[PDB]
């Protein structure tokens, strides 16, 4: 049932600076009022991260990206356009590919030999009769066989309705595959910020430990489409896209000095070897 997208205006890849982002709890041990030195795969401080922006003003971007030793993913949202991820190597039914989708009524995680389309997408439809939206186009894969892992969460619903203004929700994730465990860390935070990554510090909690055993080298995001009477044409052109954005960074094996406060919340961190001053701070544990 898939369909290629045609009315695209191409641009050079945008970039922004990751301002103290990419910190997650390295383990499940409670610590407080302590400076703890740990080495793990972290997003380097002040690093450069690729910025893609879904907008219509039509410019939207869901390329296949490398999964270099784990990925930092972040997005700014107002209407839940970003709903999922695809992870694998060839994404063409020859190997197993991890699919995470939030289709408004069920978060679904599967590891299966999916035959993916050239441009996977979801789609929501404007109703002029009543002020209500619904999800009606599901098109990520054409087939699924030799399916191995499957999880479906509880049923639910969420407001996929179009909002306007300034973005409201920053949703940060860390995705790593260690010895067959696909570890997902995440943090949700309210924001009032329109264009770039907010500056600040927020630690990412573990969320999971999916045993998949999948050799992952590339990934792709999944964007939903607004289709409305204001959008004429066939399925390949008759659409618009809500405004949102996402950022992609890559993790590297780094030593961090992590500050746990009296409540056990990580409130600051130093990326050792970032620069001579950070090395000094690491040496003095302060």
């Amino acid at each position: 049932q898939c369909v290629n997208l045609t009315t695209r205006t191409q641009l050079p890849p945008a970039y922004t600076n990751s301002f103290t982002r990419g910190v997650y709890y390295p383990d499940k041990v409670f610590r407080s009022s302590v400076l703890h030195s740990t080495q793990d795969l972290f997003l380097p401080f002040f690093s450069n991260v690729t910025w893609f922006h879904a907008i219509h003003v039509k410019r939207f971007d869901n390329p296949v990206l490398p999964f270099n030793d784990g990925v930092y993913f972040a997005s700014t949202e107002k209407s839940n356009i970003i709903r999922g991820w695809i992870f694998g190597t060839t994404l063409d039914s020859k190997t197993q590919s991890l699919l995470i989708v939030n289709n408004a009524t069920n978060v679904v995680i599967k590891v299966c030999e999916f035959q993916f389309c050239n441009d996977p997408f979801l789609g929501v439809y404007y109703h002029k009769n009543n002020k209500s939206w619904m999800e009606s186009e599901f098109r990520v894969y054409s087939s699924a066989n030799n399916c191995t892992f499957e999880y479906v969460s509880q049923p639910f619903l969420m407001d996929l309705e179009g909002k306007q203004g300034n973005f409201k929700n920053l949703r940060e994730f860390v995705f790593k595959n260690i010895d067959g465990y696909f570890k997902i860390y995440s943090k949700h935070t309210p924001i009032n910020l329109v264009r770039d990554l907010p500056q600040g510090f927020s630690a990412l909690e573990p969320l999971v430990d999916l045993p998949i055993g999948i050799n992952i080298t590339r990934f792709q995001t999944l964007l939903a489409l607004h289709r409305s009477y204001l959008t004429p044409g066939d399925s390949s052109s008759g659409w618009t896209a809500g405004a949102a954005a996402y950022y992609v960074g890559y993790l590297q094996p780094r030593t961090f000095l992590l500050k746990y406060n009296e409540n056990g919340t990580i409130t600051d961190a130093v990326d050792c070897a970032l620069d001579p001053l950070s090395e000094t701070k690491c040496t003095l544990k302060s």
Partner: protein
């Protein structure tokens, strides 16, 4: 069991794929032939076996 693979696995990695293994220098276009073996082989377990 799998007898031919381009590389070793990672720990707890699963590789259920069944594409043709190119032992030779020539592509095999996913057909069985010389230097183009199937990677999957099986055991013949018999009650009289060692």
């Amino acid at each position: 069991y799998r007898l031919f693979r381009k590389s070793n696995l990672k720990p707890f990695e699963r590789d259920i794929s069944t594409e043709i293994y190119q032992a030779g220098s020539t592509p095999c276009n996913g057909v069985e032939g010389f230097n183009c073996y199937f990677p999957l082989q099986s055991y013949g377990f018999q009650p009289t076996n060692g």
